[PDB]
């Protein structure tokens, strides 16, 4: 990650340096004239081309879903496609990614995560493989101009295009795919192929349809760029250049490819075209096709939450919504907009009208503080996505003050408005942010600081380009005048850089958090009290004193976890009320980030998946939990399986296998450890160990065979008396097979008599077992294992298996 961040920053800086060289021979007035020279029919055609491209994207998704096999309604599929493609195109995995938004939509719609990951991989690979073939097709079409545009001889371009096409049609199509076609497809359109692992690649018809859709999409994009530009080359060379630029921009991982795409366009069509018309076309195309779609998708997502999850009185903890991660995007956009407006000189007439009413030193101070507030909002955008109440309040106040300072600065209807709208939108979604955590303790990945550095560099580039009329001198910094705008921009840029550097240093020199430690007796007693006050007997595994605890700081909650390698594997869902469960999950996620460790969960209940999703964990079913319902369990009603169970009960009662219950810490121990030794003739994090205090914590039930203790099992209970679960099981080998079933049914009967509504038989792994568990005809619920960002589950499962012993 640090290497990738450094490489991306270096590439962005090189791209900006190259861009400034290419637009060296243009003044801002020429660019403004070129922008104003674009006719209204050109703008209308640009909007129409963007709409057509978005219909084509809807197609992208429809084909991807048909490839995966997931069946979705047309409206839901269209909404998901538009949202994912608008969010992913504007920003690349910086705040929100296409995978994350499509997960948050489809998983809510009730679709497994593996299919969604398949869809995302298929769309990405389809675009990445369609780009080279279309580029080669355009080259084959018009190499006469392609040689001139790219500045290489036509022979080399022709031979490389032909070689690329031949390699694709041979290996990509037949030699490496039809030599090993495969036996059968799982969905309608697939061809699973041999290799190290089976691969899901579409059939010939689906591949042809996807290629046609991608060709139409890139044609629409090149078309909007083409028609927004007055003087144009032939469409084939322009399309080739556009495809190469898109590949270069998306290959650099820069969000939106802003640095390199413009650089390639300006380096390929500089001499043959007009620098001012080309720059105006590039800026207008980016604004129309990237910023406006992002704004529209953000508004649509917030409308969906404001209607489908606010009009109905859900009365639930508002998490996993799109409020936080999209409001963070809006706040980042507001921050970058303020930073950019700081560099550009104000409108002459507006500046004069303002300065004839407000003191000019106030204008300078407002400019500087507005730039600082822009940097602050840009940095606070990270806090909003983590759902911090303090971040919400601070960002709202800063946005309001920034709007006021933009009005006080050179009169700006635009910024002021945009900001007021963002502030109102943030205010309307207060309930999404709930954590009372402190901003100064917020972990910061290098990605966000890199984005901040990139935006600051962009602002300084805009400062250098826009204020090139005024010559540079050391007296500019000391200059203070109303008409002077270059000194203003210089001071604002210097202050923003100083503030950002100070904040980055302060957050980089922070002391490391304390390492994990084994809990002491007081924390064990606290955990026991919390478990007793809760209704999750599965949490009693914390009392073994083998897992670190993360107590919630309000009144009552905890979360067991253990660190293996670079992964902080956790136990079941945090114990406590639902209102504190999400907060504890967020705290655990923050803790893992500070330690640079990947968060991993284990055996997660189906109800809490929204929180695991919104902190950035991918669901993965791994087993089933049997749950015998004690509500009815009638002794008279019988069937094929129930008759043999009561026969077992009768045989055990006749044999003399009477079962006895004991209070906690009051059972014989030497016989119990003898039974355990016989059973094993250690392990943890799933069952526990044989410790006198650990077994003392819970009640112990022992079954006696002709008076001797032969088997026992640990009992988990709660004060709520809602659910009961079994901790660990041990039977002496000399006992008959009748013993285990009799113990099971005796515990079930006692728990039913005591009044407990439900009983738990444990969790059975997914994919020769489960035959014994299903004998008691229980209700079965899924159990999920969460992994971060859809990483490799093999490493996580191997680590859990290694830690289990």
């Amino acid at each position, epitope marked *: 990650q640090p290497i990738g961040l450094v490489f991306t920053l270096l590439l962005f800086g090189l791209a900006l340096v190259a861009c400034y060289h290419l637009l060296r021979e243009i003044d801002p007035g020429a660019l403004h004239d070129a922008i104003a020279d674009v006719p209204r029919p050109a703008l209308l055609g640009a909007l129409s081309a963007t709409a057509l491209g978005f219909v084509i994207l809807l197609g992208y998704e429809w084909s991807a879903s048909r490839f995966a096999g997931v069946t979705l309604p047309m409206r839901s599929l269209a909404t998901g496609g538009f949202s994912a493609f608008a969010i992913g195109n504007a920003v690349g995995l910086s705040l929100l990614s296409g995978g994350s938004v499509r997960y948050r939509l489809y998983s809510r719609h009730g679709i497994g995560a593996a299919e969604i990951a398949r869809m995302t991989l298929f769309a990405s690979l389809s675009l990445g493989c369609a780009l080279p073939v279309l580029a080669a097709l355009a080259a084959l079409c018009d190499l006469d101009d392609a040689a001139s545009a790219l500045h290489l001889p036509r022979a080399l371009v022709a031979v490389i295009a032909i070689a690329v096409l031949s390699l694709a049609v041979g290996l990509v199509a037949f030699l490496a795919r039809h030599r090993l076609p495969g036996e059968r497809p799982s969905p309608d359109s697939l061809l699973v192929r041999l290799g190290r692992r089976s691969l899901r690649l579409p059939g010939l018809r689906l591949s042809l349809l996807q290629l046609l859709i991608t060709a139409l999409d890139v044609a629409a994009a090149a078309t909007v760029l083409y028609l927004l530009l007055p003087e144009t080359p032939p469409f084939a060379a322009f399309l080739l250049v556009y495809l190469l630029a898109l590949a270069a921009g998306v290959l650099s991982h820069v969000p939106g490819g802003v640095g390199v795409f413009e650089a390639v366009l300006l380096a390929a069509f500089a001499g043959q075209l007009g620098a001012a018309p080309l720059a105006a076309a590039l800026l207008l195309y980016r604004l129309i096709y990237v910023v406006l779609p992002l704004l529209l998708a953000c508004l649509l997502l917030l409308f969906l939450e404001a209607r489908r999850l606010w009009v109905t009185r859900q009365a639930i903890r508002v998490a996993s919504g799109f409020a936080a991660p999209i409001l963070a995007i809006l706040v980042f956009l507001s921050g970058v907009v303020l930073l950019f407006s700081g560099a550009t000189p104000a409108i002459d007439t507006r500046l*004069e009208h303002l*300065g*004839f009413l*407000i*003191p*000019h*030193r*106030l204008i*300078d*101070a407002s400019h500087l503080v507005a730039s600082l507030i822009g940097v602050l909002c840009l940095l606070l955008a990270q806090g909003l996505r983590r759902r911090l109440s303090a971040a919400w309040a601070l960002t709202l106040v800063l946005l309001l003050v920034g709007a006021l300072l933009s009005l006080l600065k050179g009169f700006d209807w635009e910024e002021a408005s945009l900001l007021s709208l963002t502030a109102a939108l943030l205010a309307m979604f207060r309930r999404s942010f709930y954590r009372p955590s402190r901003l100064m303790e917020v972990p910061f990945s290098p990605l966000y600081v890199g984005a901040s550095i990139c935006v600051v560099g962009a602002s300084v580039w805009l400062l250098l380009f826009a204020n090139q009329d005024v010559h540079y001198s050391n007296q500019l910094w*000391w200059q*203070f*005048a*109303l*008409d002077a705008d270059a000194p203003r921009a210089l001071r604002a840029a210097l202050g923003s850089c100083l503030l950002l550097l100070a904040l980055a240093l302060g957050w980089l020199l922070r002391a490391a958090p304390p390492a994990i430690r084994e809990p002491n007796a007081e924390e064990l007693q606290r955990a026991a009290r919390i478990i007793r006050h809760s209704d999750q007997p599965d949490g009693g595994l914390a009392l073994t004193g083998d897992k670190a605890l993360l107590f919630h700081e309000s009144d009552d909650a905890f979360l067991m976890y253990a660190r293996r390698g670079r992964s902080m594997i956790a136990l079941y869902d945090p114990i406590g009320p639902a209102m504190q469960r999400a907060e504890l999950i967020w705290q655990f996620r923050d803790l893992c980030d500070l330690h640079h460790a990947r968060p991993v969960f284990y055996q997660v209940r189906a109800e809490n998946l929204p929180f695991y999703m919104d902190i950035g964990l991918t669901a993965l079913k791994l087993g089933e939990e049997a749950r015998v319902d004690l509500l009815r369990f009638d002794l008279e009603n019988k069937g094929k399986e129930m008759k043999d169970l009561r026969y077992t009960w009768n045989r055990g009662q006749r044999d003399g296998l009477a079962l006895e219950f004991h209070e906690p810490g009051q059972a014989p121990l030497d016989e119990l450890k003898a039974i355990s030794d016989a059973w094993l003739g250690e392990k943890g994090f799933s069952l526990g160990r044989f410790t006198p205090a650990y077994l003392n914590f819970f009640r112990i039930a022992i079954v006696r065979h002709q008076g001797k203790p032969v088997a026992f099992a640990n009992l988990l209970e709660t004060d709520s008396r809602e659910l009961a679960s079994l901790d660990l099981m041990r039977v002496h080998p000399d006992a008959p097979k009748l013993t285990m079933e009799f113990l099971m049914l005796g515990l079930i009967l006692h728990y039913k008599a005591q009044g407990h509504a439900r009983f738990s038989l444990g969790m059975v792994p997914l994919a020769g077992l489960r035959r014994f568990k299903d004998k008691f005809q229980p209700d079965w619920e899924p159990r999920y294992l969460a992994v971060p960002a859809g990483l490799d589950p093999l490493v996580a499962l191997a680590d859990t298996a290694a830690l289990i012993a």
Partner: nanobody, 119 residues
């Protein structure tokens, strides 16, 4: 500790001419943006003219683009604004406004007491 002192002494013009002086102490009146305004009786506030810097840039109002001709002494003295042909709407008080000085810490807008100018 900056003050502005006016002296115009105008009662009646009837299409004549008069001169106004705005004394200044705190600032050198050399690199200090400063101007004049108008407060008609019962009306809102309007401006008349301005001097930007070094006695070079001087923007006038809409109705007095060529009527008036203001100038600055260029030293640490008063600036001069003069009256001209009959403007019935000019029967108002005239303030002396200073919004910028050489100081970078000066945020306040200092005004003048104003002179009753009538035709």
């Amino acid at each position: 500790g900056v003050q502005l002192v006016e002296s115009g002494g105008g009662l009646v013009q009837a299409g004549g001419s008069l001169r106004l002086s705005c004394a200044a102490s705190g600032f050198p009146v050399s690199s200090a943006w400063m101007a004049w305004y108008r407060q008609a009786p019962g009306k809102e506030r309007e401006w008349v003219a301005a001097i930007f810097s070094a006695g070079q840039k001087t923007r006038y109002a809409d109705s007095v683009k060529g009527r008036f001709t203001i100038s600055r002494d260029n030293a640490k003295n008063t600036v001069y604004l003069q009256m001209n042909s009959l403007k019935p709407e000019d029967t108002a008080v005239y303030y002396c406004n200073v919004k910028d000085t050489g100081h970078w810490w000066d945020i306040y807008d200092y005004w003048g007491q104003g002179t009753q100018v009538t035709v």
